[PDB]
Structure 1
Amino acid sequence: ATTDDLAFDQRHIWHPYTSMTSPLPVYPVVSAEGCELILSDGRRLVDGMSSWWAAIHGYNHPQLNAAMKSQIDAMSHVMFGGITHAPAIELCRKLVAMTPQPLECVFLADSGSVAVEVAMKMALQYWQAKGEARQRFLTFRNGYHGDTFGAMSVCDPDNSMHSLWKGYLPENLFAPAPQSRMDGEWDERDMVGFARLMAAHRHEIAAVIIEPIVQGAGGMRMYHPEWLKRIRKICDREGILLIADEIATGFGRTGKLFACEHAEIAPDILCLGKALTGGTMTLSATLTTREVAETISNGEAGCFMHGPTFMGNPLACAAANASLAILESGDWQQQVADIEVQLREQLAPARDAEMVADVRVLGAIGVVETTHPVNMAALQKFFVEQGVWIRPFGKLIYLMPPYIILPQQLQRLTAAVNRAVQDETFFCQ
């Protein structure tokens, strides 16, 4: 019965970065609760992914659910043009309140990529209004900022295989990936490439854009906070805008509410998403300073030229309010600290495995980088059999569980990672 469904899905439905010619199997999920995904056949999976960062409160959270159902009773949606409403205002109040002081103007959007493109567009309009046609962005390699064309143009030029897009995408400036680790000692030579690029191009750079501390989808790399302090200083001296993409790192995942706090710096533009809504549905936010906001607004345009149809969607704002309200308890701090400790401890053995190239842990992020890319289909199948949901990518078998994950649940995950990495059959050499 559901095998006819899976057949329709296989034949008609794209999934993220998949082939319609030879799609790989996908598992049917019927529901989810706490930290468990429930398949059609009833088997339960402990979630190690938070549905990619965002589901930090796990699934079927009573408070998120209630907040969503209430907003639906008022209105799930109304347009934002000439109209405002309580959920957008409350959400923005919470966002302005919890972010670094200068960030006080909020542009709500629908997705991470759109938030990034909004940030980029802000930087571009800023310099138009200041009369300097700056159009380049300076970023890091191993960056990932989304799949829309603006966002691609600041993603790593190799990973996004921009070679196939090199011609459509404008060429931005890419400093080397930050090499100094976050459990690292800082090394001053790390700064050399970035500084040179700045020096050679400081006049055409509208903004520097980086994922602070954790380069997520670009490799789950965790680099030294000194990088943010220097880039912040470098940006200040050149008057270049700093765009911090915290779409992945936002709302506590790295042990701090925003990864920028690891460096105690503030961006000129801050992109948020994913866990913003507690992973219930899509929403994003791009915050900026009053200075950027006024400059753009006093430009030739007379406004910031962006407006998604479903901008400020009340239902998503309500879910965010609820998600942010749960974080207000502050329980996430210890939860994330405890997950971090347990991940360091339980993933440590993997360092000795021959298939493992590195193990790094930060907040509720646990990463086992392997020497050869994983055999996706085979390893995915293995994980389901171990009763866990772990979604590896390339040479990364990583964990980012909901903050409410129970220690025995986290244990099942780390045990599954350790067991998988010992065995070379789950890897392609």
Structure 2
Amino acid sequence: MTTDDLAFDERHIWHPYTSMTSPLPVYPVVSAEGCELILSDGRRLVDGMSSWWAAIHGYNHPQLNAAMKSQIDAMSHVMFGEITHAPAIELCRKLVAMTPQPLECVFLADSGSVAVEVAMKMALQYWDAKGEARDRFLTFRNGYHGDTFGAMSVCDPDNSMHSLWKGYLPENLFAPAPQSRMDGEWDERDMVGFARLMAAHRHEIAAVIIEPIVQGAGGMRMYHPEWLKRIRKICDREGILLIADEIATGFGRTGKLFACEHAEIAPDILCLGKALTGGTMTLSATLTTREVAETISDGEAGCFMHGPTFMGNPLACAAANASLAILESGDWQQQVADIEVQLREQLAPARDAEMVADVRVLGAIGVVETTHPVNMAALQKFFVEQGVWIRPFGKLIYLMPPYIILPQQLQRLTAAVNRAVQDETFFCQ
């Protein structure tokens, strides 16, 4: 990449949640290997972000590469309507086995947002074929489920700018955000804003949808698994369906294969993505029980009414099988247990930092929340200079590294974080 390349980027190319009029700098990445990213100027950053949850195996993993190139040689894409193929089968084969028993019907899709639209749509079609008028969704505050309209309607109203879509956006129910903390004391009084919400719309709710244990893009919070136990039971008695978005938490990122395992519960609907394909390309997965599967298919339409052009993309499915294959090894269990300890350990000094509100860790997830928003460009510049890639946001500086990160690598990350939160230099307001 050249001087004129980088100038084309700023003037024409949108980035996630970015201004065209005032964009802040970006760093030119030409390649990536192991737990590192390589900038065009040859610098190597240790990766602290896993490209946002996804790249749990690092980059240029050889297993991943070979599976990818072999599938391309057979065909990297062929339509799924209505053709089938070996990658798709073996992917839905794994997915069903590794998830709770009742989850055995699988809808592959292209992104996390699309899959959340699919769960959502499954819930409405389920109640419409049952003769029940249930169009409402119930979710926690601070939740994040995607950027598409439907999923936007289940995101934190304030975090997101729902005032922006005041009028277009359909109005749902948001219970207070889970106060009791993962590995903390369960306070009964936590269950009232929810209790009353179910009470007054109990007749109306088509589904409850939350991020299990970890609320990701809504603030990296980590609530008490006791919450999900309470959630499974009310849904069970109410009949209303439980949607688990494990698109961020999925595939043992939290120290357990799926996050619902923290409360030994299973959802009625499970959304997966991101880490699904080991951070190689976009793929998504929505699983459900056969009873939902059939009650939707025996309805008015005769079918579940969804089906994107690139459904079941063999290439993606191949990356996915390669990734689940790495996991099946089980070696991830100790990688994460080890990363957890070193995260909990080396982030500990941080709570004594004047700028730090809270430090919480679960699995390969280390969160250090400040009392003021980071100075993005400033901080972002200071991380690179340290040889590390860490994408901070609002009041959060956090780590979520490849499972394969070497202790000395984790160490630099954790050292950059402490370093960065002890001076008021990289903060505003």
- Distance in 1 (alpha carbons) for counterparts of 2:183 and 2:373: 24
Moved over 2 A (4+): none
Deviations 1:332-386 (A, max 9, x none): 0000000000000000100000000000000000000000011100000000000
> TM-score normalised to the size of structure 1?
0.99
What is the Cα-based RMSD across aligned positions, in Å? 0.4
Deviation for aligned residue 1:410: 0.2
Give the CA deviation at 1:3. Answer: 1.5
* CA distance in 1 between partners of 2:423 and 2:27 (Å): 23
Q: CA deviation at 1:218?
A: 0.4
2-side partners of 1:249 and 1:268: how far apart?
A: 17
CA deviations 1:165-202 (Å, max 9, x no partner) are 12111000000000000021111110111111001101
Cα distance in 2, alignment partners of residues 305 and 117 from structure 1: 11
> The residue matched to 1:287 in structure 2 has which SS?
strand
**Once the 2 structures are TM-superposed, how far is the Cα of residue 283 of structure 1 from its aligned partner?**
0.4
User: Partner of 1:32 in structure 2?
Assistant: 32
Distance 1:131 1:418 in 2: 57
How far did residue 62 of structure 1 move? Answer: 0.2
Rounded Cα–Cα distance in structure 1 between residues aligned with 2:314 and 2:49:
27
Local SS of the residue matching 1:103: coil
- Once residues 114 and 93 of structure 2 are traced to their aligned partners in structure 1, the CA distance between those partners, rounded to angstroms, is 21
Deviation at 1:101, TM superposition (A): 0.6
What secondary structure, in the 3-state scheme, does the structure 2 residue paired with 1:270 have? strand
SS of the residue corresponding to residue 261 of structure 1 reads: helix
Q: Secondary structure at the match of 1:122?
A: helix
Separation of aligned partners in 1, 2:166 and 2:425: 36
- The aligned counterpart of 1:290 is 290
Q: Per-residue deviation at 1:82?
A: 1.1
Q: Which residue of 1 aligns with 2:228?
A: 228
Q: Distance in 2 between matches of 1:200 and 1:166?
A: 23
What whole-Å deviation, never above 9, does each CA across 1:182-233 have from its counterpart, x for those lacking one?
0211111101111110011011100000000000000000000000000000
Give, in angstroms, the shift of residue 161 of structure 1: 1.1
CA distance in 2, matches of 1:401, 1:289: 33
Q: Counterparts of 1:151 and 1:423 in 2: how far apart (Å)?
A: 38
Deviations 1:225-273 (Å, cap 9, x if unpaired)?
A: 0000000001001001000000000001000000000010000000000
Equivalent position SS for 2:78: coil
CA distance in 1, matches of 2:262, 2:383: 33
Q: What CA distance in whole angstroms lies between the structure 2 residues aligned with 1:362 and 1:326? A: 22
Deviations 1:92-124 (A, max 9, x none): 000000001100000000000000000000000
Structure 1 CA distance for aligned equivalents of residues 26 and 398 of structure 2: 19
| Distance (whole Å) between structure 2 residues aligned to residue 84 and residue 343 of structure 1 | 44
User: Is 1:82 equivalent to 2:95 in the alignment?
Assistant: no
* 2:346 aligned counterpart, secondary structure: helix
The 3-state SS of whatever aligns with 1:164 is coil
In 1, distance between residues paired with 2:125 and 2:334?
A: 41
SS at structure 1 position matched to 2:58: coil
1:305 CA drift (Å): 0.3
For the residues of structure 1 that align with 2:383 and 2:104, how far apart are their CA atoms? Answer: 43
- Report the Cα distance in structure 2 between the residues aligned to 1:117 and 1:91, rounded to whole angstroms: 21
**Could you report, residue by residue, the CA deviation over 1:6-47 in whole angstroms, capped at 9, with x for unpaired residues?**
100000000000000011100000000110000000000000
- Aligned-pair CA distance for 1:155: 0.1
Secondary structure in 2 matching 1:137:
strand
Q: Who is 1:414 aligned against?
A: 414
Give the match for residue 193 of structure 2.
Answer: 193
Deviation track 1:45-102 (CA, whole Å, cap 9, x = no partner) reads 0000000000000000000000000000000000000101000000000000000110
* CA distance in structure 2 between the partners assigned to 1:202 and 1:288 by the alignment: 22
> C-alpha displacement at 1:284, in angstroms?
0.3
Question: How far apart in 1 are the matches of 2:9 and 2:400?
Answer: 27
Aligned partner of residue 359 in structure 2, secondary structure: strand
1-side partners of 2:167 and 2:70: how far apart?
48
Q: CA deviation at 1:130?
A: 0.4
Cα separation, 2, equivalents of 1:424 and 1:24: 20
Q: Distance in 2 between matches of 1:87 and 1:187?
A: 46
Structure 2, unmatched stretches of 5+, are: none
- 1:163 Cα deviation from its structure 2 partner: 1.0
* Corresponding residue number in structure 2 for 1:326: 326
SS in 2 for 1:285: strand
1:344-359 pair list within 5 angstroms: 344-359=344-359
The gaps in structure 1 that reach 5 residues or longer are: none
For the residues of structure 2 that align with 1:127 and 1:207, how far apart are their CA atoms?
A: 10
CA distance in structure 2 between the partners assigned to 1:27 and 1:183 by the alignment: 38
CA deviations on 1:374-406 (whole Å, 9 max, x unpaired) are 110000000000000000010000000000000
Give the Cα separation in 2 of the matches to 1:295 and 1:183.
38
Q: Separation in 2 of the partners of 1:127 and 1:173?
A: 18
CA distance in 2, matches of 1:49, 1:423: 23
Identity %: 99
CA–CA separation in structure 2 for the residues paired with 1:167 and 1:115: 24
Deviation at 1:423, TM superposition (A): 1.2
- Cα deviations across residues 119-148 of structure 1 (Å, max 9, x unaligned)? 000000000010112111000000000000
Q: What is the match of residue 125 of structure 2? A: 125
